[PDB]
Amino acid sequence: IGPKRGSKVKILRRESYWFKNVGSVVAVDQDPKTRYPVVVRFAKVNYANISTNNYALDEVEEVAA
Amino acid sequence: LVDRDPIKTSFEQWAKPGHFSRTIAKGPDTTTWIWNLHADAHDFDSHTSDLEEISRKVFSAHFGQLSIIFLWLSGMYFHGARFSNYEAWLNDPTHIGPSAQVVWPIVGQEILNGDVGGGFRGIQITSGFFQI
Amino acid sequence: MSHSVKIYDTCIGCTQCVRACPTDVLEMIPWGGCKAKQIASAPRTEDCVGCKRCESACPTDFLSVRVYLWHETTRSMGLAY
Amino acid sequence: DIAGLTPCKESKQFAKREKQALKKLQASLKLYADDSAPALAIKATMEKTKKRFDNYGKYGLLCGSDGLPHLIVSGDQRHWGEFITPGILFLYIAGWIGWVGRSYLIAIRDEKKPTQKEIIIDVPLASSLLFRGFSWPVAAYRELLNGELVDNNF
Amino acid sequence: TKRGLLLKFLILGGGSLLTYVSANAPQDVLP
Amino acid sequence: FVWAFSLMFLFSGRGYWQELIESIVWAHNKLKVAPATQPRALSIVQGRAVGVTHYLLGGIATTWAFFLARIIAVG
Amino acid sequence: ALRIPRFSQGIAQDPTTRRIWFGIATAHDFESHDDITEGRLYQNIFASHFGQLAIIFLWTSGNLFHVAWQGNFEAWVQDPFHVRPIAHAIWDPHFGQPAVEAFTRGGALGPVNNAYSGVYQWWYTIGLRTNEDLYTGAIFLLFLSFISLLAGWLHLQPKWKPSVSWFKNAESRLNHHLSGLFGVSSLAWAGHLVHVAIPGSRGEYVRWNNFLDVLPYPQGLGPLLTGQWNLYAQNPSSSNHLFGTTQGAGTAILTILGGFHPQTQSLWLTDVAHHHLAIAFLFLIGGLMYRTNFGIGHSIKYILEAHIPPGGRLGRGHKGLYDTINNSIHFQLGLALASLGVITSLVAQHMYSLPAYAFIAQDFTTQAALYTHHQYIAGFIMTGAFAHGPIFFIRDYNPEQNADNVLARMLEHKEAIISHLSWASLFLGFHTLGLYVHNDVMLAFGTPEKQILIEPIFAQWIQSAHGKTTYGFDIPLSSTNGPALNAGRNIWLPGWLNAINENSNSLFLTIGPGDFLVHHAIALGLHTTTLILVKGALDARGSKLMPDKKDFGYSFPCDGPGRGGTCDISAWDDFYLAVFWMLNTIGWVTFYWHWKHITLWRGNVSQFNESSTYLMGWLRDYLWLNSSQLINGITPLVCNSLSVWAWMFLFGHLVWATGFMFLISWRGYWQELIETLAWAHERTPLANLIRWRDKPVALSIVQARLVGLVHFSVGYIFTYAAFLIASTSGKFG
Amino acid sequence: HSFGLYIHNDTMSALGRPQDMFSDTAIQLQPVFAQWIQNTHALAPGTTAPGATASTSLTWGGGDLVAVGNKVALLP
Amino acid sequence: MRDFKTYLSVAPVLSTLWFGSLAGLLIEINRFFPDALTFPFF
Ligand code: CLA
Ligand code: CLA
Ligand code: CLA
Ligand code: CLA
Ligand SMILES: CC(=CC=C/C(C)=C/C=C/C=C(C)/C=C/C=C(C)/C=C/C1=C(C)CCCC1(C)C)/C=C/C1=C(C)CCCC1(C)C
Ligand SMILES: CC(=CC=C/C(C)=C/C=C/C=C(C)\C=C\C=C(C)\C=C\C1=C(C)CCCC1(C)C)/C=C/C1=C(C)CCCC1(C)C
Ligand code: SF4
Ligand code: SF4
Ligand code: SF4
Numbered sequence A: 001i002g003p004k005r006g007s008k009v010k011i012l013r014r015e016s017y018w019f020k021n022v023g024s025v026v027a028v029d030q031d032p033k034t035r036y037p038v039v040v041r042f043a044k045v046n047y048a049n050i051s052t053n054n055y056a057l058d059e060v061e062e063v064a065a
Numbered sequence B: 001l002v003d004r005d006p007i008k009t010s011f012e013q014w015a016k017p018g019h020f021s022r023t024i025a026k027g028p029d030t031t032t033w034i035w036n037l038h039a040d041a042h043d044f045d046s047h048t049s050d051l052e053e054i055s056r057k058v059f060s061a062h063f064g065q066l067s068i069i070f071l072w073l074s075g076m077y078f079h080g081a082r083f084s085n086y087e088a089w090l091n092d093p094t095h096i097g098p099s100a101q102v103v104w105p106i107v108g109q110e111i112l113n114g115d116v117g118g119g120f121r122g123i124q125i126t127s128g129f130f131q132i
Numbered sequence C: 001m002s003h004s005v006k007i008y009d010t011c012i013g014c015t016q017c018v019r020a021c022p023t024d025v026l027e028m029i030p031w032g033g034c035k036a037k038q039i040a041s042a043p044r045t046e047d048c049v050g051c052k053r054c055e056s057a058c059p060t061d062f063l064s065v066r067v068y069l070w071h072e073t074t075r076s077m078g079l080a081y
Numbered sequence D: 001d002i003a004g005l006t007p008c009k010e011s012k013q014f015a016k017r018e019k020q021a022l023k024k025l026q027a028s029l030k031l032y033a034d035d036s037a038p039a040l041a042i043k044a045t046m047e048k049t050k051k052r053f054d055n056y057g058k059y060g061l062l063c064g065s066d067g068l069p070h071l072i073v074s075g076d077q078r079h080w081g082e083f084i085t086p087g088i089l090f091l092y093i094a095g096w097i098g099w100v101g102r103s104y105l106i107a108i109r110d111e112k113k114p115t116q117k118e119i120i121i122d123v124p125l126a127s128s129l130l131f132r133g134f135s136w137p138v139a140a141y142r143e144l145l146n147g148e149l150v151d152n153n154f
Numbered sequence E: 001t002k003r004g005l006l007l008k009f010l011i012l013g014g015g016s017l018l019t020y021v022s023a024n025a026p027q028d029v030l031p
Numbered sequence F: 001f002v003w004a005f006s007l008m009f010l011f012s013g014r015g016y017w018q019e020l021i022e023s024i025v026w027a028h029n030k031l032k033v034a035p036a037t038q039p040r041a042l043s044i045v046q047g048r049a050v051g052v053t054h055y056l057l058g059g060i061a062t063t064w065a066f067f068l069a070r071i072i073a074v075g
Numbered sequence G: 001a002l003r004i005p006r007f008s009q010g011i012a013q014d015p016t017t018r019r020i021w022f023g024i025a026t027a028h029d030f031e032s033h034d035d036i037t038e039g040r041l042y043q044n045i046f047a048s049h050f051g052q053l054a055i056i057f058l059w060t061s062g063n064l065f066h067v068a069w070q071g072n073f074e075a076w077v078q079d080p081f082h083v084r085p086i087a088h089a090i091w092d093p094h095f096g097q098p099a100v101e102a103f104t105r106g107g108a109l110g111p112v113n114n115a116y117s118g119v120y121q122w123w124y125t126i127g128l129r130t131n132e133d134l135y136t137g138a139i140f141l142l143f144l145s146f147i148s149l150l151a152g153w154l155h156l157q158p159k160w161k162p163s164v165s166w167f168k169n170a171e172s173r174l175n176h177h178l179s180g181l182f183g184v185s186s187l188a189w190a191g192h193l194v195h196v197a198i199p200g201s202r203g204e205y206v207r208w209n210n211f212l213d214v215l216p217y218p219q220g221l222g223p224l225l226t227g228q229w230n231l232y233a234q235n236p237s238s239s240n241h242l243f244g245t246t247q248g249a250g251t252a253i254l255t256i257l258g259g260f261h262p263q264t265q266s267l268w269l270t271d272v273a274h275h276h277l278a279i280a281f282l283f284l285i286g287g288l289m290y291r292t293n294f295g296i297g298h299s300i301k302y303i304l305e306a307h308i309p310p311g312g313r314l315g316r317g318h319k320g321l322y323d324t325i326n327n328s329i330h331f332q333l334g335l336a337l338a339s340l341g342v343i344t345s346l347v348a349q350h351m352y353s354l355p356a357y358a359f360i361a362q363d364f365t366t367q368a369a370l371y372t373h374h375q376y377i378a379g380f381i382m383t384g385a386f387a388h389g390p391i392f393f394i395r396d397y398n399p400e401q402n403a404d405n406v407l408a409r410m411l412e413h414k415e416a417i418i419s420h421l422s423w424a425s426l427f428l429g430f431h432t433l434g435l436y437v438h439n440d441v442m443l444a445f446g447t448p449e450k451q452i453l454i455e456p457i458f459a460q461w462i463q464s465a466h467g468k469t470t471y472g473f474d475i476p477l478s479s480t481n482g483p484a485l486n487a488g489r490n491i492w493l494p495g496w497l498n499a500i501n502e503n504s505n506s507l508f509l510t511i512g513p514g515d516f517l518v519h520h521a522i523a524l525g526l527h528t529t530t531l532i533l534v535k536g537a538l539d540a541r542g543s544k545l546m547p548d549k550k551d552f553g554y555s556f557p558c559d560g561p562g563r564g565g566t567c568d569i570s571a572w573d574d575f576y577l578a579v580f581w582m583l584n585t586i587g588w589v590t591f592y593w594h595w596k597h598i599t600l601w602r603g604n605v606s607q608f609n610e611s612s613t614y615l616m617g618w619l620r621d622y623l624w625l626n627s628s629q630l631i632n633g634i635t636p637l638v639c640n641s642l643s644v645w646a647w648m649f650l651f652g653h654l655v656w657a658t659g660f661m662f663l664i665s666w667r668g669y670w671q672e673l674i675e676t677l678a679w680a681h682e683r684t685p686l687a688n689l690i691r692w693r694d695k696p697v698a699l700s701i702v703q704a705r706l707v708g709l710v711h712f713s714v715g716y717i718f719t720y721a722a723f724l725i726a727s728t729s730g731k732f733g
Numbered sequence H: 001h002s003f004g005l006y007i008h009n010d011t012m013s014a015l016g017r018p019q020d021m022f023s024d025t026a027i028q029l030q031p032v033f034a035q036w037i038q039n040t041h042a043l044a045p046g047t048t049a050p051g052a053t054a055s056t057s058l059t060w061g062g063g064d065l066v067a068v069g070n071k072v073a074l075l076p
Numbered sequence I: 001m002r003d004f005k006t007y008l009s010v011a012p013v014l015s016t017l018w019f020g021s022l023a024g025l026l027i028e029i030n031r032f033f034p035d036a037l038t039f040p041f042f
Helices: B054-063 B087-093 D012-019 D085-093 F003-012 F015-030 F045-049 F052-066 G038-046 G057-063 G138-144 G147-154 G182-195 G274-286 G319-325 G339-350 G381-387 G424-441 G455-460 G513-522 G529-540 G572-578 G585-592 G607-608 G642-659 G668-677 G701-706 G713-727 H004-014
Strands: none
Touching: D012 G701, D085 F003, F003 F045, F015 G057, F015 G529, F015 G572, G057 G138, G138 G147, G182 G274, G339 G381, G381 G529, G381 G572, G424 G529, G455 G513, G513 G585, G529 G572, G572 G701, G642 G713, G642 H004
């Protein structure tokens, strides 16, 4: 806590169910390393019975900001 | 379920989302489970993995048929009575063409109510009381 | 394609996730870093029929497979007999 | 007046309808109720469709051939409230069905776990957001298009 | 039993004489 | 009529009325009026449940009418 | 386990029967199946439909060839009184001796079935008459329809180029066509009607010998080139005519004068020809509009490009719509389909109230099984139109190459598009259906009054600003005079477009509350039909449930269970689903004409009036009234008038019904008992060893959505086929 | 044997040659059905049967008529 | 016992005491004016 970790993020890929909608996050990755970090989470479910997916900062367009 | 099982509440389960297999109706909202709930409402692969009860339900929720067949028939004996035509028809069979039901002349209704025998307006019958 | 339906996802972890599907899917082939580190989308698929039991469970987050293979043996439908 | 014929003040074809047809209603020379106290063709059912004489009100009402009455409503000669009068009425009633649709709804998505409060109903009909509709003077006709549901939220 | 290339022969022949004269007739006895 | 409504329940896909139910769900969200209680299409076999049952209560009372109307009155 | 079918490969060694069916229905899918190149393909559709035109002339030939030796003509051109023309001689060994009973029809000998196609009033209506004078038909058309094949080959043979790149121009072609083709195709027709036909009509013959010696006039093409045209149109025809024999003939081609006649309705002799002429400048003036090398005119981009009317300063592009309608070939075959689709009905809805033939309506049958084979089709198109513009989006199309660009945005801003479509239907739904049950709850209930019944105001309206000089009525500026036209009068709208009410054949039939419903229920059809086609199309690409729905887009019918449960969600199966409403509009609409017409002939019209404002009645009198004739035609008392028809009509009810299997069956149940039913043979003597070469299976999981359909359809379309005929023929009307 | 049976008729009565239908009279059957078991039911009150005027079900082959004085009821 | 800012709940189909009734009072206006098809005003 000091910058911004997981406090409000849209999705922008167009495949991902809650795509353009902004729900909440969690333990976003630490290290330099990989390509699929970030958990996100929101109320609304989706086509599977369980939906709580991990997208990745190449993107999260949050966008402003 | 899980709720209070115990021993430790007469306090009935009115309030707390769900019941019916176990990542159940989930917190997370949906509609499918509202046709679920009515469908398969009676079933047995859930309620408990253990006979026991089920025959203890089916011998009860049976019952409410007889009772029903019984609230039914009443409104048919009453009906086949004071909404008469049975008195009228019997001194006068070969002749009559029986009724038990009749409208009330609200809106369009009445056309449905058309001279049936011992001198009155109503809708006929093909359900052979008046004959038991 | 001749069995080409994509169930991929991103975790490709397979614990309380997905196993079901007659022979086809001998995976756990850990790619150099993907969390519970077992990945991809299949093994040698020239063996069995056309399920989507394939997802039904454990994410594909996109599509999920089904029939799309066309070129379709018989061993690839129960009935060659 | 317009394409069909004139109202009730005269409508020959219409007259014949009054008359045969209903009155055959009659049709039952007797059929017994000389004094008897049920079988009510007799009183009204006719007379309630009938004492509807050379009066029905008077309504204008155009009446074509066979003299069943047609509805113009083009706002002229007489016929205006065969759509608008009962038209704005349809509008006003609905819209205060869904003004409150967009209400015992936009009042929830908050506080603590609000995930189906709706299969039960918090205030029945809303009975709180209730009159918001008659308590629409102007309302969405401004505050819908400016602010709240504001293009922002668009 | 000289079957050594045939059948095309018996499907013009046989079947042009189960149908040539078979349909035609000199004085109807009509449909 | 009801019968000739069954076929629609009997004869059709399923991610169809989904694919449709969203266009709907979209227009819904703009005014802010839908999401809560994830509206969903019919449960493949529910769909068949609302075939059949209709096809019968349709195709049947049809004659229940057809009949009582040719024994009342001559016959 | 061998190798066979010569184009595909996955299909080719598939051991089942799919091997077969799926062979006979991938044939025509050139773009992408083994044998193909953008060079192959094109040409492989080119000498294909040169295999077209080709088959259209072996049709037309024989049309003119079961006619010339029998099938009355040196009759029906003696005076065509509504008694049973002729197509061809029915000849089936199954026929009883009631070969003798009508079926065997008057003039000719052995039994026959009469022209319900129009041909018989246009092989006649352009003159073409005498039974010694006539027996050409095939002779030409066929010494034509073979050439039709010759290019086929010639242009298939490499060498004398079959042409490859040259297939993506436009400008050149269509700079060619809508001149070369249409224009001169008109003109040249303008040619024919006029030298050889108009004379054959009002006037007299033309003898196969002379063609110079015959001269519509005494002193030739007179001025004409002398800009002086006008004095064609003076004493052109007359009316005390006796059609075909002069006498009250007169001879001055062209007009707009005179009009209707109890002796023939039908557009005047001339007018269908100044017109054919008149348009033939515009297209020729049109042709010559684009490049073709010399260096005038236009490049078919650079007037799209940044053309754009409301674009300009509204942040909404227009990039190479050309190299995407051109590089598409599907965009192509579906801007093709429609236009044709929209005009196939404009043809066939104008072909009545304005039939252009010598005795037609006042025939009233051929006139009613001819509006519809042009209503079926036409509907049948439209769908296919809408269906090759949901294939463009998958096989072709190219998001990186089209974007900000107005074909996109169309995709992009799509969720609304189906909704503000669906909102039309749902409204157009229950609101038609309030009005029609209500209208049927009120009758039955005893109260014919109370009946809800809106006049079709904005309808009749269009027509009291035309000619519907029905029982007066001013209208503010019009009155029925003071101002009339002022700027128009005795030119143009003479006797024509002046049919008025004409209870017989007035063109415009006098519209009331019966028509303010069907007319809203043909409107609830193409709307609903298209929310599904629009939708069908507006994502053969994918969506939420199936996001990546592609590389095959079209017919991938089915998917696995789970996700929500996924099904007929290929843009084909929405096409598949579409075709039911194109088969329900194109029925409300056709249904409507006829009831109307029927009644508007050998009798009333009040009939459709208070008895189409409701629903039951649409079934009772029409449907139930007016079948009579046909069905008591197999009758327990011998085969009477019609028998083909009623047996067709039950053939109609079976082919239909038997759709359903296919439709409520779904490969699973079928395959499995064939698993048990192919344990027979193998396990039974006098039927062992005996090998199939194709492995017994149950139909593909798209295939049967088709076949029930392609089954649902004939039944259905073969039932009205035999229904209307089998009752517009009897009549009474 | 159980439906196209009917379809014969159409195809051949619409063809029309009754000679050869399946009529209760064209294909060989001749103005009687009778000799089976119906005719040994209404007639059985003369076995081990005691009796009692009529049968068991008036709708059987043998004897009797007189059934009702408004409309009808059952007969053979 | 109910003051300000929403209240107490209610069942699955209290709509069956809302179709039946309310709506039901409306036949009750469709016999007071036993008829429609336009309407006088107040
Ligand atoms: C799917 C089906 C199909 C079928 C089976 C038919 C069948 C028919 N149509 Mg038809 N039609 C269709 C689709 C179809 N149509 C479509 C999609 C349209 C809309 C475009 C039409 C629009 C249409 C019209 C407007 C008419 C018909 C008519 C007819 C009937 C006339 C017979 C005929 O067509 O010979 C066809 C004849 C030919 C193919 C040869 C003539 C072609 C000429 C124009 C060639 C000119 C080339 C010339 C050599 C160039 C000269 C150059 C040089 C000499 C200067 C026949 C019932 C006619 C009718 O009303 O009958 C009562 C007429 O009214 N149709
Ligand atoms: C006028 C023309 C037009 C043209 C030039 C084409 C051309 C093409 N269409 Mg097409 N199409 C059209 C109109 C047209 N279509 C219309 C109007 C529709 C619906 C209204 C369609 C619906 C359609 C579909 C679904 C598909 C095509 C496809 C294609 C491509 C392959 C053709 C094929 O599969 O046939 C091969 C078919 C056969 C050899 C015969 C089997 C066809 C069956 C269904 C018979 C149909 C009914 C029949 C007359 C009833 C039996 C007769 C009875 C008397 C016994 C090819 C690009 C395919 C494609 O490539 O898309 C990706 C395919 O998906 N079309
Ligand atoms: C006669 C038929 C039956 C009915 C009533 C419908 C009705 C409908 N179809 Mg449909 N359909 C049918 C047969 C039917 N279909 C068949 C056989 C097929 C092919 C197999 C299809 C294929 C099809 C497609 C592809 C589509 C439709 C769509 C629609 C909807 C279009 C919107 C509309 O028309 O207004 C709305 C509806 C009506 C006027 C029908 C009455 C509905 C209300 C009034 C019910 C009455 C309430 C009643 C008092 C309460 C009783 C319920 C209970 C409490 C007792 C509509 C619901 C489309 C759609 O989804 O639109 C958005 C589109 O998807 N249909
Ligand atoms: C009118 C109907 C159509 C027809 C012809 C059939 C026929 C059949 N159905 Mg079926 N079905 C239908 C509609 C139809 N169905 C529909 C609409 C549904 C659901 C909506 C179903 C649901 C269904 C189920 C679940 C089952 C069947 C089964 C069957 C088979 C039963 C055995 C039998 O008697 O077949 C043969 C006899 C006929 C089909 C009738 C006679 C046909 C006539 C016209 C003779 C033609 C033969 C002649 C040589 C023609 C050649 C001439 C040449 C020009 C081609 C049979 C193939 C069952 C089965 O396979 O069990 C054996 C199975 O249980 N059906
Ligand atoms: C001119 C007109 C018109 C119109 C109208 C119109 C003008 C219409 C149109 C139509 C069209 C259409 C209807 C089309 C459709 C199609 C489509 C839409 C397509 C789509 C697609 C898809 C699906 C995807 C992609 C591809 C494609 C594109 C194919 C008219 C005019 C007029 C009038 C009337 C009035 C009077 C005057 C006049 C002058 C006489
Ligand atoms: C349109 C409608 C209706 C229709 C309807 C139809 C059009 C049909 C229906 C039908 C139903 C039914 C049908 C049910 C039932 C029933 C019953 C009761 C039955 C019985 C029986 C039995 C017992 C068994 C079998 C046989 C029978 C069937 C007889 C309505 C509409 C509407 C509107 C406008 C809006 C609001 C709502 C409403 C008001 C609603
Ligand atoms: S998504 Fe499916 S099978 Fe794919 S990686 Fe996970 S569980 Fe493995
Ligand atoms: S999904 Fe496919 S690969 Fe997987 S098991 Fe099923 S058939 Fe086999
Ligand atoms: S059809 Fe059946 S199986 Fe096939 S996809 Fe649909 S559901 Fe699945």
